[PDB]
Amino acid sequence: PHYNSFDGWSFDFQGTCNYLLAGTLCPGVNAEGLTPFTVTTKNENRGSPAVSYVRQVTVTTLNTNISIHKNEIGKVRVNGVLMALPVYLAGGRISVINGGSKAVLETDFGLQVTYDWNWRVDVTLPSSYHGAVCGLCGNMDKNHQNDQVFPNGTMAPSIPTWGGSWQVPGWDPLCWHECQGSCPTCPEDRVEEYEGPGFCGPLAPGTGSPFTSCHAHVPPESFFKGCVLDVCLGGGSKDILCQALAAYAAACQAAGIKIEDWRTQAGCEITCPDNSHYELCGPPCPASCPPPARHTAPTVCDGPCVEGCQCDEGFVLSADQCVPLDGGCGCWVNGTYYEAGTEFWADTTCSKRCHCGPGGDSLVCKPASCGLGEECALLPSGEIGCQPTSITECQAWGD
């Protein structure tokens, strides 16, 4: 995809497997004031091998892993269960908090990396350990040309192999950094036709175009080439244009400058549910009842505006949708949020089939387990769930 490092660097490497995104001490050299961390990114595809887009983002800090698999919430806990929008692990003041269109976290250090539910990734240091950075972010020293070196520390002349060099240790079948075979590069003729108004139009720099004030704070020049490249290589549907524009809009808005409306004139408007008050600029950290409801407020909640369908008007925002003020708004159990009684699994032992009474400020649980030839190991991006012990195969042979 399109990258922007902790250093002042942007690049468009494409990948197929987990790569080291961020982190501080790959070799562990700086053994002073040591609080090491590491985060990794993974790229998947949806039909066209020309490019790849973020699928699952993984981090590992202070004996605790985190992962998001491009959906509404969760997959972050070490036990394997998915986590809600606000949640407190209670160990080391760690708490994941997700904005209406964002998903950040915090710890005793205050590390905050925000990934959208669909291919929009951003990391931010807690200013805890800032000295050296290990991962795709690079050294992150003032210079931007020295970021690319191998995890072994050697000079890296081949940046296409950089991701594989920093890829997750192990064997990754069918993970090619570049398209080994013939690659269906988009023709040059359609780029002039598609770049006009109505398709990557507002993204283009223009005083008449909306959010012209947003141009000074954040340069969209990187966004401009990306829009054309990922719509021409794509079939040309309008959703790609909306997702391309929204990224630059949110970036320049969080830079601090307000934005005037562009969704209506461009034809792409979100059909958000319930209250769904779409606002050009509205407060971040929407009103959500904290699972502790008494712990300290995240430091990121005091921040600039973000474009998203705020639901806080009337009903509050909880469990990724709008819930009325009398709604459950989470179960509030040991700093953990249980949303609308989704009948979750508390622990990996499969015993705790806990339905959540979120308005009751407590949970009603059952001790049953899967069994029945399906043991309760962790499912891929799911609660502790059943998985068959063994499945044979009947071959109905034919001549």
Binding site: P1, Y3, F6, L21, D122, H130, L136, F223, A244
Partner: peptide
């Protein structure tokens, strides 16, 4: 130096 709180952004596609 307390003034280089920095960010890393990964943009989809």
């Amino acid at each position: 130096v307390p003034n280089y709180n920095s960010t890393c952004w990964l943009w989809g596609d």
